[PDB]
Subunit: 574 residues, 2 copies
Amino acid sequence: LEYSELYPIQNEYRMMQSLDGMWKFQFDPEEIGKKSGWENGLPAPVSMPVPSSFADFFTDHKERDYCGDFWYETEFYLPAEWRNKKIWLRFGSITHRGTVYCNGMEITSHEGGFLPVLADISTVAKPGQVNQVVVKINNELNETSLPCGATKILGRKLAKPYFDFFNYSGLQRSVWVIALPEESVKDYSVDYELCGTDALVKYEVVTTGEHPVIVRLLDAEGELVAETEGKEGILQVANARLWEVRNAYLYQIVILITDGNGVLDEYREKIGIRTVRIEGTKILLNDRPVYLKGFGKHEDFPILGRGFHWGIVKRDFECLKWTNANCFRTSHYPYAEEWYQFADEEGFLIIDEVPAVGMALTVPELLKSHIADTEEMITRDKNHPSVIAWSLFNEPETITDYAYEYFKEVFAAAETYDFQSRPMTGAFEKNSKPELCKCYPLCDFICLNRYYGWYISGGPEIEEAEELFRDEMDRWKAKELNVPFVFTEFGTDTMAGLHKLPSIMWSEEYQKEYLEMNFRVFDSYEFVQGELAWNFADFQTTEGIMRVDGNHKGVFTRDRQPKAAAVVFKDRWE
Amino acid sequence: LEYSELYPIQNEYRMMQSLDGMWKFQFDPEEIGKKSGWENGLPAPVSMPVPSSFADFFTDHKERDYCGDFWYETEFYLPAEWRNKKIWLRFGSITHRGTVYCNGMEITSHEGGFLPVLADISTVAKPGQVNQVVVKINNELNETSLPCGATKILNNGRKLAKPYFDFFNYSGLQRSVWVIALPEESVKDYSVDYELCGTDALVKYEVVTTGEHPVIVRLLDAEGELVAETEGKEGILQVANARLWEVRNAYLYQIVILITDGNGVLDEYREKIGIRTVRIEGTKILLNDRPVYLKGFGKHEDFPILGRGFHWGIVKRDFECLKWTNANCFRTSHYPYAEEWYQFADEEGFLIIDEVPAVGMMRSTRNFVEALTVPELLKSHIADTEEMITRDKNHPSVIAWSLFNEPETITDYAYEYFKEVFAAAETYDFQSRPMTGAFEKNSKPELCKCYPLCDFICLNRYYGWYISGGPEIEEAEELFRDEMDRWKAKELNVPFVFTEFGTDTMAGLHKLPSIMWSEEYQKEYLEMNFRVFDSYEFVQGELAWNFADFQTTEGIMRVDGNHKGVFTRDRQPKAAAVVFKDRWE
């Protein structure tokens, strides 16, 4: 990559300053901003919180549903001391695609709305002065970038997703301006081997120069436990304190660039010594089988939309721990980096998912976008101990040799980017029948999204649903694939407060009964090794006749309170 | 004050770095932290978001309801280039009281949970190194500090807050925290006051600095163009063809305050201000020499999960909802809000009644839930008043100070108490703008001794809810008119603003005919209240209780908090919201 994905830190060599706050903001329905000098400042802005999705602040439909080009602007004072450092704007994300300007100059553009955007403003930055950043953003959906959809023209544009979740957009994550030394740590990778009571931390370091590198490992108390020299090497850890499920331990890696007797740069990050591998039908963490228990989530909260906030992280993890979960999938896009940092702390397992949802010649361009997002996700997230698997798709077509050749390239790219070569998978929709699917052989383990008892034979037909479920799982069993299966979606829309005896679809009681039936099926097959329910919480969707204020398959409400079924998960996962 | 209330800025002379994020946090039920050295680091912390109230993250009662001592900790890297600066920790607030430590050393303590806490760490700060901050906080309620309440001790030693007020006892680090660096000689405070002279305006000012060097004051218009300049720590800026700050039509100048030594500039403070005058004339509230009728709400700092935690997103949604109702005003019930609320009101042209947390001074609810505590309470009350006014005086949005909410007012003792508060407020406010407080119904026109202290009178009344609700609503209207006729007959010639009126209203509860708690009853109640308001010339404002449903202590009279919101807690309109929109249009 032409930039670093490394999370920004502050020390003797690296500086950072937050640009979060109220930005200037303006819609550009006529698409004349770049024609009209907007990159030098917006002509008639309103204020817009950053980080946040813009949609749910407004009281009018056309602003909430805005689709097209729209602009952000802010000003920041740059400390004079940042002079002659490499100065970067770092956006947690820009959703979905955008062009960054600084002091009237075009800096960079990015496609993909859920991963960091880095813009090198070294040559245009004005140390000791007020600087200006302007971002042109677009939130349309197409079939050549992720996530896929269409754009309808009423000249007013309307996003038409091929995915369920609401098309939130804007500057949904924190924005920093940072300063790095001229020769810096750009990237590093760690991989682990367990040796009795000891451990090896294998590493590679990429810098922007040719000076020597020293790598140190500190324990949780900051004590030096290992040290070595070189951009490539092994850190030997005696009596290693392994990072364990729901029982984290984090070391601190310290990467130094040196020039004789002085340090040029120093990067530090918390990491966790752990191994993950698929062995037969088992998922092994540190050589012991683990059964995944948890949820698909979303970045979704009232008013903020996908806007990041530590308070949402904290509540969600307390709820997760209360259910006795150990895992979540980042459905259906990489989350803010902070979610992974916290999962590292709390010992949660993550399946990290690229926004390959909603899946013509456009396909070669789509593949490029999909591979680019995969590269960025893996480079960003590989050193989190929590991240134990990559999900490279959600419910694509998989039953043609055409689909096979496409995903072969994606998986091949993912493999080259992940230093750890940790398990890769994808979530299969029901149409990927065991007799037809061509893509499951690409996977280290198989993830199934199934709604037997909701979309199939729901309600009075739920007994039929269970037989149909068992019939499919019997077909999978007969294949003797010798791989683990994880259910990554299953659930029922459930309106909090809707009670019925006997239960009906949409009642709290039916949600319980549906889950109990699914558990019976899960527990009937030895090779099922994980259950991640859909969804952790009710979340916003495109409005329509099938969505009663978003998706109500949450086990929790949108404001994070338990429906009756939450207790069912709690008791089972205990 | 021994510190500056000025909002932090980033420029050539002043630096700031946010400490917001995930802090370490630990409850201290046995109160052993200090003797155990926790100021050097918490021994078994959990993670806690800052800014946020801590209560609503947890899944267990005892953590949510925790009352007593609890501790926060974080670490930060201090840029080497901050050496030879004055270095301060600035907490937007610390709720309710706390002691700030830095690098293991006690720095300062503060009482009052809703105003900035400044800690001078200059003598212990380590530039070019990681530094540590640890804060011991306490969230108990008592009768010698604001807001008032009691602390109950359960048989097993566990403490439980017992407020004398109807808002949940949220606490912790609810606002942003910065570490900042100032020049050794800096602008510490300034005040502006306005006079209108035809098409022109005068900006009278005072500047307080921490030194003796000369001061230069400039005023820039909204385009950054210089419109006035003068010299001296006291002076007058002459603005030709002034663009006044108007209700729901803001215009903001930028004041620029420079400290110089001739050779160069030592400090430069900048803030947006709005040229506007506020006065009471007879029964009229005059903004810029024209009557304004206040339309809006009492609010709260309250949102799901975050509690009172500050977030710009909440500000933005709330102001969009306010504008949609055609409101022009809110009261900061019942405590000063985060500074950002006022910054945004300035921008949006909203009027604010800024309220000190003098709530819970009602004898009835105290007894339900003194000679020696009242003198100490007065001191706390006056201190909070001084801090609020010093912090907020230069906002064009702030047009009035509310110095109490529903205290006892019918004794001569209460008069002497509030006489001192109002006297203090007057001396701290350079503008001497209107002062008021909100009166409960027990403050009968025949008995109240304190309303003469006010420049305009704010009434909290619930005729049709607590008094003669539902089938008796006709009687409620009669009783309401009876009281207002008594006020009318006093011919006080001052404006009256209703600062509370409303009904608990469950979203989705519909009934025909309406019942108390239904959406339809909220509408009917409001219509009845409007009919009464509109019958009296001297009524010049209506601020409904409340903007949005909000959290309270749980109990038999609170169904998941207070439901008198016109909006839900997640900021969506009940049926009554349109009633306000249509009326205020």
